[PDB]
RNA sequence: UCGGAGCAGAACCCAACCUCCGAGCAGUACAUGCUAAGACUUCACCAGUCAAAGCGAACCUCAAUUGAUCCA
RNA sequence: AGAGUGUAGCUUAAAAGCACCCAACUUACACUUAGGAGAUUCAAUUGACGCUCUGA
């Protein structure tokens, strides 16, 4: 297991960027998960990491759980895997002159 | 090798001997408003920002509020009515400024029109679309008006009393990019009395192409201090109507200042189309706003373990055949 | 004398046509930043703010109890400041939002009356999808 | 070969050809949905797997009851 | 008599945020939801009104 792409790296979407057990990596922007604890590509474009602190979401009362032995003080921090889209969207073209 | 954090390293300092002394997040609004104010930070080691991003007027509002609790009294608690009229009206006196200019950037109008410099607009005007005789569209800051219903010339209001008013639309249409389209030119207002001040450029309507998003059309008038000399009458022409506002604004409006402003967006209409026909007197242009296509994976010899889709990936389409009848 | 690439240049131009793109990961940490308009209330004692981010977090319109000028004439103050804020989205133009607010934040009495309020003013919380292709 | 009570009285562990109950089980099932990009590849294929966007929903009992490769 | 002096308890706030307390769920605590109570001491950058410390 691991990342099996490096950041900055272009990638089509859907391609395996990171596999863990625990998950070593989190998601960023652009990063597309299932039930594998896995990170793929969810648009084409460059691969980036960030050190950003994780919220869990109000289901997981466990996390809550943890979230509260953490001190008020107490920052958790994560490393999440952003997908900055290289291209864009789609763009508007003449079609005709009626 | 081992690296450690170059900035500060989080969790460190509030440690100490004693970590069961800690405070410790009780409330998950706690932990929720001690991470945002770590978020705000821009930090050390990196984020997705890095790579994307008066006593009296205290005193009567007090006694106000003690009114208001009095005559609440608790029982109107126990459910006030809290007209936004009122609140509005008040919040355009007292702090509208600071939410115009947040909606003049949001917009990109100063962006765009005046090559940045953003300005809180002090004067507050407000259009009203003639659509009849009654009621009259309301146009404030970003309100969208039709093609269909923009057909004649709009009425303004900002309860002030030299005026200059232009409409610009910053999409750029039709010609080059990084320009705006004129369409009214109002100079030297006596007063509230627009029509008092001369009319350079006529009103026009608007004219969006099809399929080509949404443009976004602004009204301003700017605080003139003395009147100045313009200049071009009506005219359908479409190179004498592209003109930058920033340029206007830089080496022209040397004793102006802005005063308000008004946002609108525009879209292809009955009306547009009518405009391109009659009067710009040319075919009118329809966009398409196409994605990027597939890249397309790499072609080989054999197919490998894949299902039959990969030998028909790299040509066009459903009845193609053999060597030749 | 037509470009073949005419751009307008609206901001409001894709994510009105919805077209707007959009973070798809970020699922662990919680809110997701996969939406365009998100109503973000933050309450505190006795005043509270409201804003409307947007992807980038461009908070455009904000309503707050410290604004001084609705101080004359709290539950009920969250539906007056949500009826506030629908009216200034109507005049702005805002129609499609982003409410994702804490499951305790959601059985409030106060958010559940600004989201009627602002339902009334004619502004859904419902973030539709940008349709593929 | 494996468990429940005491020896082993209040986070673990603890010993006896120690003191007593037990076990080689039994009973009950086989959204555990459809569709759909983009990837892994048993070094060919076959066989197998991961999974984004969409439609349609939520939001095993037991007390032990067992063991290992190897050749079948 | 002198020094330090001044936003509710706290603020490298300019009238906000942390804090106060009440209830319901709590054995209880905590959280959450509903609440409200809360302050730049007064006169023209200056003066005094209020307190701590040093004295008597
Ligand atoms: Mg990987």
Redesign the interface.
Known sequence: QGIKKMEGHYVHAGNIIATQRHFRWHPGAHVGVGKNKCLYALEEGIVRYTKEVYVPHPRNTEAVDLITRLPKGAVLYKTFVHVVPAKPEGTFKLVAML | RRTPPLGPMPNSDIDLSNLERLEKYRSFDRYRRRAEQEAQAPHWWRTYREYFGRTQQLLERKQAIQELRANVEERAARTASVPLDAVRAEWERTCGPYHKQRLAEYYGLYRDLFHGATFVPRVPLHVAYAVGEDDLMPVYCGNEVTPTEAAQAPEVTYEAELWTLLLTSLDGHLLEPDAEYLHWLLTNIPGNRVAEGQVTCPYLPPFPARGSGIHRLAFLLFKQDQPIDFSPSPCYQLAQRTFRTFDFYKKHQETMTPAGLSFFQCRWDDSVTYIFHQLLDMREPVFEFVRPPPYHPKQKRFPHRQPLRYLDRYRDSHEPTYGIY | ??????????????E??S???K?????????S?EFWHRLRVIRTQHHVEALVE?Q???????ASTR????????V??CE?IG??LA??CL????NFMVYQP???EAASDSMKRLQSAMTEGGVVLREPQRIY?
């Open positions: 004398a037509v470009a073949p690439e005419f751009t307008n240049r609206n901001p409001r131009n894709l009105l046509l077209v707007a793109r973070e798809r990961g970020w699922r662990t940490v919680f809110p930043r947007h980038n977090g461009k908070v455009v319109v904000s604004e001084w000028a609705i101080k004359k004439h709290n009920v103050a007056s009826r506030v009216q200034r005049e702005a133009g805002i804490t499951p305790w292709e």
